[PDB]
Each structure stands twice: as C-alpha cells, then as structure tokens.
Write an enzyme that holds these catalytic residues in place. Structure first.
Site, PDB file in Angstrom:
ATOM      1  N   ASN A 152      -3.817 -36.145  -1.075  1.00  0.00           N
ATOM      2  CA  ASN A 152      -4.335 -34.970  -0.713  1.00  0.00           C
ATOM      3  C   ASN A 152      -5.778 -34.911  -1.520  1.00  0.00           C
ATOM      4  O   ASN A 152      -5.871 -34.839  -2.680  1.00  0.00           O
ATOM      5  CB  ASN A 152      -3.470 -33.800  -1.353  1.00  0.00           C
ATOM      6  CG  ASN A 152      -4.187 -32.406  -1.048  1.00  0.00           C
ATOM      7  OD1 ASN A 152      -5.176 -32.332  -0.824  1.00  0.00           O
ATOM      8  ND2 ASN A 152      -3.267 -31.524  -0.698  1.00  0.00           N
ATOM      9  N   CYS A 161      -8.988 -26.480  -1.106  1.00  0.00           N
ATOM     10  CA  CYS A 161      -8.519 -27.166   0.054  1.00  0.00           C
ATOM     11  C   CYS A 161      -9.059 -26.945   1.387  1.00  0.00           C
ATOM     12  O   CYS A 161      -9.038 -27.801   2.426  1.00  0.00           O
ATOM     13  CB  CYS A 161      -6.755 -27.427   0.278  1.00  0.00           C
ATOM     14  SG  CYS A 161      -6.398 -28.465  -1.050  1.00  0.00           S
ATOM     15  N   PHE A 187      -2.187 -34.955  -5.298  1.00  0.00           N
ATOM     16  CA  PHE A 187      -3.647 -35.030  -5.291  1.00  0.00           C
ATOM     17  C   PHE A 187      -4.245 -36.524  -5.537  1.00  0.00           C
ATOM     18  O   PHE A 187      -3.880 -37.178  -6.352  1.00  0.00           O
ATOM     19  CB  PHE A 187      -4.433 -33.959  -6.354  1.00  0.00           C
ATOM     20  CG  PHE A 187      -4.055 -32.667  -5.706  1.00  0.00           C
ATOM     21  CD1 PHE A 187      -4.467 -32.333  -4.440  1.00  0.00           C
ATOM     22  CD2 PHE A 187      -3.083 -31.921  -6.491  1.00  0.00           C
ATOM     23  CE1 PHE A 187      -4.216 -31.066  -3.871  1.00  0.00           C
ATOM     24  CE2 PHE A 187      -3.066 -30.474  -6.021  1.00  0.00           C
ATOM     25  CZ  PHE A 187      -3.391 -30.155  -4.754  1.00  0.00           C
TER      26      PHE A 187
END
Ligand SMILES: O=C(O)CC(=O)CC(=O)O
Ligand SMILES: O=C(O)CC(=O)CC(=O)O
Lengths: 381, 376
Positions: free
Chosen positions: B323, B151, B202
C-alpha cells in the site's frame, strides 16, 4: 471568455473572524517575558521591546491564553517537545475559527449554504487526517458531497494561491460556488525566548491569529448575488535560492522560523517584474493607477515595496490598517485586506470596491521567496 | 480543446526492498523484539493475510541502527523522520517524473504546472519547490503542494489536474504522488496490536503523470481521458479511519468496520458518476481500485459482483509494492495499460472504452474518477 457572464471567477462575499482573546502590542513584551518566566533576561527583554516597537502592530488576537500557557509549560520553553499540545489545540480550534469566518461570508452572500459545491481550506497551523476541511463540513452542517481541497503547510503566500486555485474551480465547473477559508494561528510557533536564538523574537513579535472566508463563483445570479471583485488573473513565481532566505520547519518543538535580513529587499526588488508580467497584457504600466493589496509580511517589506515602486503613500493604507489591528496572520492577511479595502471604499464614499479604481493587484509572498500575483477588477460599491 | 488527458505515466521506488515472507523476522529482529514470541506470531499471520509479496522502503537497517527512536513504539521521532523524508520524498518524486517526461517526449521546459502530493513529511517551502530545483524547471512553473492528504488523494489529484488542464489553454500539468511508510514505521507493542496492521501494509513509491488538454497531433500520445471526478465521504467515517501527526510520527486508527463500510458505499458513488453516461453494468468497465488492503479488494469485488479478473491490475500492484497510499492508483493505471499491451488488447483499458478509478482514505472519504481509454 474574459468578457462573458459565464465568464470570470468573482469574489461574491468576504467574511473574517478572530479569537476573542487579544493582546496589546505595547504591553506584549511585559506579558511575554512574564508568562514565560523570563524576566531575569533584562537585556533580551529590551531587545524585544525594540522589535515590537518597530512592528507597527498595535494588537494581535491569540488562541493561546495565559491559562493554556500555564497548564502547558513546554509551550513556554524555547524547544522542549511541544508539537502534541499544539496539535491538540489547533486541530480543534482552527476549523472552529474558519467556521466563524465562513458564517460571516455566507451571511453576506445571502444564498443557502447548501448551494456551496466546493470547499478549499488553507492553514499552516496544525495538520490532521482527515483534515480541517472535513471538520469544517461537519461544523457548518454541509453535505458530504461538497468537493474538498485541503491545503496544509503553505505559509504566507497562500492567500494568493487560494485565489489562483479558486479561479480554476469556479471557471471550469458550471454553477460551482467555492467556499475558500484561510485560518491561521501563531500557536504553532509560539515559544519562550532564548539568548542563543535572538532572531526568533521577530516571529514572536509578528504573528497573530485570524481566519478569512470568501465565496467564489462565475456567472452571478442577477438580483441575488452581488460581486465584490473579479479575479482577472493569478500567477506564482519564486526568487531562485529563496529557501536560503525564508523557511519554516515543522519539528518536535513546533514550527521553526528562518528569515534572513535579505528578505525585505529581495522581495521588493523582485515585485516589479511580477507586476509587469501580469499587467502588460492588460496594457497597464502605471502602478499608481491600481488599488493595492499587499501581504504585510512585516512593516519593512511594506515600506520597501512602497519605495521601490514609487507608490503614493496612501496606496498601502488598507494593508497597514490590517497589520496594525491584527499583526501578520499568514495566508489570511491578504483576504482581511481585501475586505478592508472595500470597507474603506464605502466609508470614503468612493464608487468602486477598489477605492474608486477599476484594476487592482494583490501580491503575497512567503517561504522560498515564493511570490503570488493576482490581478483584480473592482465592482460598483 | 476539450477534456483533460493523461499523456504519460511514470513510476519509481526506493532501491531497498523487503520480501513479505521474511518481513516478520526482519521487523522483530531489527526492533530488538524477538522476545515477544506471541506477538511475532500474530504479525506472521497478519503479513500472511496481506497478499503483499514485497515492499520497497527508504528506511534501511543502517538507518534504523543509527536511530533507535525509530525502533521504539512511541519515543520522540518526528525530527528524524522529517530529516529523512524532506530530502528523500522530492528525490523519489523526481525519479518518477523523469520517467513520465521520457514517455511524454516533450521538453520539460513546456511543463506549466506542478502538483505534488504526499502524506510523508511536511516542510516550507514544500517538496514541490524542491522538485522544481531537482528537475531543473523554471521558477514560473505554477505549483500546488498537497500535504497530509492520505490514501484517497490519487483520485483527488486527478480531480484537481482536470480543472487545471481544462481551464488553462496549453497547460501541461506534472502531477506527482510520492509516499513513504517511514513516516509511520515504529516498533511493536503488545498494548497496541492494531498498529501491526500498518506495519504489515505500507510501502514506498512515487508515481508521476503528465495531464493536458488538446494533445499535439503526432507528438503527444494520450493514454486516458479524465471524464469526470467527484469526492464524497461516509458520515462519521473519521471514527473509523484517521491518522494523526504527533511527536512519535504518524499514528494509525482503522477499525474493523472499514472494509464493509467502504464496500457498501461504493455502488452509490458509481451510480452517481456513471448514470449520466448511461452506464449501469460495472463489468462493462475497466477498474482501478485503491488497494487499501486485501479485504477491501475482495469485499468490493463481492459487493459489486465484478468478474474476478477486473481487479487483477489492482492485486498485481498490492502484491508487488504493498500500500503506497496516494500513489497506488497511479501505479495501477500504469499497470492496467501495460497489461493491456501484454495481452494484445486494443485499448489502454483492457480493450474497453470506459473505466472507473476509485480511491478512499481518512474520514472514509471516497474519490470516484470516470476514465476513458485510448487506442493502445
Ligand atoms: O509563518 C508563515 O505562515 C510563513 C511565512 O512566510 C510568514 C510570512 O510573512
Ligand atoms: O496512510 C495513509 O496514507 C492514509 C490511508 O488512508 C491509508 C489508506 O489505505
């Protein structure tokens, strides 16, 4: 710029390390067919002896021991699920091997390890998040503000890539000192033999384990640092359609190996244009006026590059020495060779780290028929 | 002949997407888990707290139906994830790249370097090589392939591209971050409730930027300047945030201590980056924050005392895409300059001069990038 002391990136130290366990190439066919319970494959074994004979490898170091293979029989199969055990081994052992090489480079460099500002870690042997770079910071006792770059799953050309990368890190960051580590293990691709996959025996004969570390920096401290080589230039290319010829995939069974018989001649016939592009701007066209570092992807490639370029037979001696003593350690090979070339220069009483010559070339190659070409300048011995 | 500049930003997502309000029903149905009534209710609550409204995804109902190992919790699945991702990740990166090159408006043959970043699958040669083929670039483009970063890596790619652009005269760097939750998608399990967080969070997407120094007058239009970039990590962070690539795909380990530990460490990163520029008022900056989850956004806002609108672009991207790992902060860079134009503000950074981009990820690694805006 290329003429300044706040100038070019320099190799300031080189260290290397291998697993303590090793196996002799002459006895490897017996070891391999015994430990994988394959001695009933008599014809395949003889094929493997011939392959091992042609490698010109005399020994390889190996993280994988008989004890580990016996505790993990999936490793001895051809294609049973094995990535999890390979990862359990490699995620721990690769940073430790990198640490051993790093300690030797830092010892030669002789500056405090706290003055390392950047870390580049390169391996195709396992992956994790956070990576082997993070683990290495912990194992070496460096600070969390070391700037890290983690290069996973690159393959055989990546020693040249790391020099390419390190050059920009060192030249664009005043005072930067880059620890670069290439650490590799054949444990990611070790598997038992199969009569329906004879071509994989090439991989089982070739790859060995080892790690190399270098310190890279511009503007060396007078009377404290002793430059070994200068990274004059670095450039990558690839041969179009090379991925049809050389590729490796990470699967549930570990790393696979695809390498056609076209690979050595295709590489050999493309190296001269790389040399010309790199060296014509320096006014060099005689390849025997250079010292040489060649990725020993296999003995056939070494021979065919020598023959296609018309190199004197001793030019690739350091390359052949490393292939002989360690086998193909993927990205780490060209840095072992770099170390070997200066060591042999000192042994022969020559006047530069590059066999008494000024300019040299490091050429590596790997998946996709990627080729990396690094021009080097030697330093007083 | 000075600092590295962002010269263009493009983004792309898979066409398939799912709305977060209906994701618990989709997820428990397609994984044949509707008998896990209490677990489904926990998942509803988790999805509710994400502040995510939608996510794009490479994985369709048809692909799941054809590959039931994907719908299990931990059956061997890496091979099918690799078969999907090794092909689809470079194609998604190509879509984002075409949009960045269109904004840049220079010939794609003048790109000299390519940096490709993903944690979604690995291969040799890599997605960078595939992207060269898909875009029709030459083999002499200088490639760097950054696999399995996670990330924080949008900040890393900026750090890296700065040195490539500044040390190579005339260089033009195509940087691509392309990510897919397909590497970590799996069915639910009552003995692994914490993995539901990952299944809720995600999404998929790719972002591309062109980076270069010394812009061509009247041809290139700089968007941001990369003033500085620095990495650190919180010691022992790997005990709190880690992801392992296994035969079952990518796993997810994230403790409840992650948001507060990040939030309490960002101020020292800001001070180290911004004190040399003489900046100490964090509300005088525009902001790009990796939206690792809604709780981290809230806790950074609260710990730093930011005005509530500072993290609006960040929240917009979390809302519209979830995300997307390393690509998030580049979507947010794009969003902050688009929102600046919408609001009639005079710089790409909400009318302000200096900004900060802050990302974080495995190991509690933190990347801090100081940015300078450009006229809108
Ligand atoms: O196994 C590797 O690291 C990939 C490769 O290209 C071997 C060469 O030679
Ligand atoms: O899934 C990843 O890419 C790793 C990570 O750190 C998630 C954040 O947030």
């Amino acid at each position: 710029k290329s003429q300044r002391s706040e100038g070019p990136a320099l190799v300031l130290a080189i260290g290397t390390a291998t697993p303590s366990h090793w196996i002799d190439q002459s006895s490897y066919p017996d070891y391999y067919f015994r430990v994988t319970n394959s001695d009933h494959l008599v014809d395949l074994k003889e094929k493997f002896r011939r392959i091992c004979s042609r490698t010109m490898i005399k020994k390889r170091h190996m993280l994988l021991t008989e004890e580990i293979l016996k505790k993990n029989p999936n490793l001895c199969s051809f294609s049973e699920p094995s990535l999890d055990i390979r990862q359990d081994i490699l995620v721990s052992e690769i940073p430790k091997l990198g640490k051993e090489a790093a300690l030797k480079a830092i010892q030669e460099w002789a500056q405090p390890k706290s003055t390392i500002t950047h870390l580049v870690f390169c391996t195709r042997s396992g992956v994790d998040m956070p990576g082997a770079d993070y683990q290495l910071i912990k194992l070496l006792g460096l600070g969390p503000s070391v700037q890290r770059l983690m290069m996973y799953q690159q393959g055989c050309f990546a020693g040249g890539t790391m020099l390419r990368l390190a050059k920009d890190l060192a030249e664009n960051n005043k005072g930067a000192r880059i620890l670069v580590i290439c650490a590799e293990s054949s444990a990611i691709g070790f598997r038992g033999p199969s009569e329906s996959h004879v071509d994989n025996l090439v991989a089982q004969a070739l790859f060995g384990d080892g790690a190399a570390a270098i310190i890279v920096g511009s503007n060396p401290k007078p009377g404290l640092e002793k430059p070994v080589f200068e990274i004059v230039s670095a450039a990558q290319t690839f041969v179009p359609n090379g991925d049809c010829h050389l590729a490796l995939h990470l699967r549930e069974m570990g790393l696979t190996f695809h390498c056609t018989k076209d690979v050595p001649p295709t590489i050999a016939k493309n190296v001269e244009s790389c040399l010309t592009k790199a060296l014509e701007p320096l006014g060099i066209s005689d390849w025997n006026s250079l010292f040489w570092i060649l990725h020993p992807g296999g003995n056939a490639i070494v021979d065919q590059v020598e023959n296609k370029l018309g190199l004197e037979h001793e030019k690739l001696r350091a390359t052949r020495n490393i292939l002989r003593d360690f086998g193909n350690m993927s990205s780490a090979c060209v840095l072992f060779i770099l170390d070997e070339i200066r060591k042999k220069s000192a042994r022969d009483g020559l006047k530069t780290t590059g066999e008494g010559l000024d300019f040299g070339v490091l050429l590596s190659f790997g998946p996709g028929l990627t080729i990396e070409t690094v021009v080097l300048h030697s330093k007083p011995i």
